[PDB]
Amino acid sequence: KTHVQLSLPVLQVRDVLVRGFGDSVEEVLSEARQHLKDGTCGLVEVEKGVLPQLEQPYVFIKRSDAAPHGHVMVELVAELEGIQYGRSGETLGVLVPHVGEIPVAYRKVLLRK
């Protein structure tokens, strides 16, 4: 399927144990996609002071369209030293590995895979 319905656990930035997916734009997009498939991906909502507490490169989910079955259609965009790889809509948050942190909420997305 070109799209997959996921429910992503929303984590508080200070709870996150593994603060990024790796060391290159290509690796973080690769790892983010693998963790999304394996159900081991969390979402941190971006506000003042969040991104400096996480590791670059960043992987964002961004709104790809204006929401089947409650699921917002999203795609992945990476960012390293102020350059983004991908072009999409509004940021829903930054992806991180989920290693058992307790979420505050769930974000239903339809991921362009």
C-alpha positions as a printed NumPy array, in Angstrom:
array([[  0.   ,   0.   ,   0.   ],
       [  1.243,   3.56 ,  -0.824],
       [ -0.223,   4.702,   2.552],
       [ -0.422,   3.065,   6.006],
       [ -2.693,   4.104,   8.918],
       [ -0.518,   4.605,  12.029],
       [ -1.268,   5.839,  15.574],
       [  1.976,   7.504,  16.812],
       [  2.613,   7.854,  20.576],
       [  3.201,  11.564,  21.392],
       [  6.195,  11.842,  23.825],
       [  7.337,  14.74 ,  26.071],
       [ 10.822,  15.868,  24.833],
       [ 12.357,  15.447,  28.367],
       [ 11.235,  11.739,  28.497],
       [ 12.86 ,  10.811,  25.179],
       [ 15.792,   8.386,  25.678],
       [ 17.014,   8.141,  22.067],
       [ 16.921,  11.673,  20.697],
       [ 17.333,  10.918,  16.962],
       [ 17.594,   8.252,  14.281],
       [ 21.267,   8.621,  13.234],
       [ 23.981,  10.729,  11.693],
       [ 23.044,  11.528,   8.026],
       [ 19.873,  12.782,   6.291],
       [ 19.684,   9.463,   4.371],
       [ 20.129,   7.363,   7.568],
       [ 17.535,   9.241,   9.668],
       [ 14.871,   9.02 ,   6.875],
       [ 15.739,   5.274,   6.466],
       [ 15.579,   4.583,  10.231],
       [ 12.392,   6.693,  10.684],
       [ 10.658,   4.651,   7.93 ],
       [ 11.827,   1.329,   9.491],
       [ 10.594,   2.385,  13.029],
       [  7.25 ,   3.585,  11.541],
       [  6.818,   0.135,   9.872],
       [  7.858,  -1.727,  13.146],
       [  5.554,   0.395,  15.425],
       [  8.646,   1.691,  17.339],
       [  8.354,   5.425,  16.359],
       [  7.281,   8.275,  18.666],
       [  6.29 ,  11.865,  17.852],
       [  7.417,  15.022,  19.716],
       [  5.295,  18.162,  19.146],
       [  7.551,  21.089,  18.165],
       [  7.48 ,  24.164,  20.434],
       [ 10.041,  26.731,  21.671],
       [ 13.061,  24.859,  23.083],
       [ 12.158,  21.343,  21.769],
       [ 14.484,  20.993,  18.742],
       [ 17.71 ,  22.056,  20.553],
       [ 16.986,  19.148,  23.029],
       [ 16.952,  16.599,  20.116],
       [ 19.743,  15.395,  17.807],
       [ 20.178,  16.502,  14.181],
       [ 19.504,  15.474,  11.525],
       [ 15.767,  15.838,  12.446],
       [ 12.927,  13.853,  10.783],
       [  9.61 ,  15.788,  10.619],
       [  6.137,  14.57 ,   9.723],
       [  4.48 ,  17.263,   7.595],
       [  0.83 ,  17.462,   6.397],
       [  0.777,  16.324,   2.71 ],
       [ -2.932,  17.135,   1.993],
       [ -6.168,  18.752,   3.445],
       [ -7.921,  13.325,   6.541],
       [ -9.287,   9.788,   5.879],
       [-10.817,   7.945,   8.923],
       [ -9.341,  10.674,  11.284],
       [ -5.781,  10.012,   9.889],
       [ -3.967,  13.175,   8.612],
       [ -1.945,  12.351,   5.466],
       [  1.735,  13.061,   6.203],
       [  5.14 ,  12.642,   4.607],
       [  8.736,  12.67 ,   5.961],
       [ 11.087,  15.695,   5.574],
       [ 14.627,  15.64 ,   7.11 ],
       [ 16.573,  18.739,   8.284],
       [ 20.362,  19.214,   8.849],
       [ 22.037,  22.61 ,   9.622],
       [ 18.948,  24.527,   8.4  ],
       [ 18.482,  22.645,   5.08 ],
       [ 15.365,  20.434,   4.521],
       [ 15.284,  17.372,   2.235],
       [ 11.745,  17.206,   1.02 ],
       [  9.023,  19.795,   0.57 ],
       [  5.63 ,  19.423,   2.344],
       [  2.995,  21.2  ,   4.499],
       [  2.745,  22.117,   8.21 ],
       [  4.904,  20.184,  10.771],
       [  2.83 ,  17.821,  13.013],
       [  6.033,  17.023,  14.983],
       [  9.541,  15.51 ,  15.011],
       [  9.951,  11.695,  14.928],
       [ 12.134,   9.846,  17.457],
       [ 12.626,   6.193,  18.354],
       [ 10.109,   4.888,  20.902],
       [ 11.758,   2.619,  23.507],
       [  8.828,   2.413,  26.011],
       [  8.379,   6.063,  27.117],
       [  4.794,   6.727,  28.365],
       [  2.949,   8.922,  25.828],
       [  0.692,  11.923,  26.628],
       [ -1.475,  11.294,  23.503],
       [ -1.684,   9.557,  20.121],
       [ -1.57 ,  11.255,  16.689],
       [ -3.439,   9.284,  13.926],
       [ -1.594,   9.707,  10.58 ],
       [ -1.804,   8.2  ,   7.08 ],
       [  1.896,   7.842,   6.146],
       [  2.913,   8.1  ,   2.462],
       [  5.162,   4.948,   2.401]])
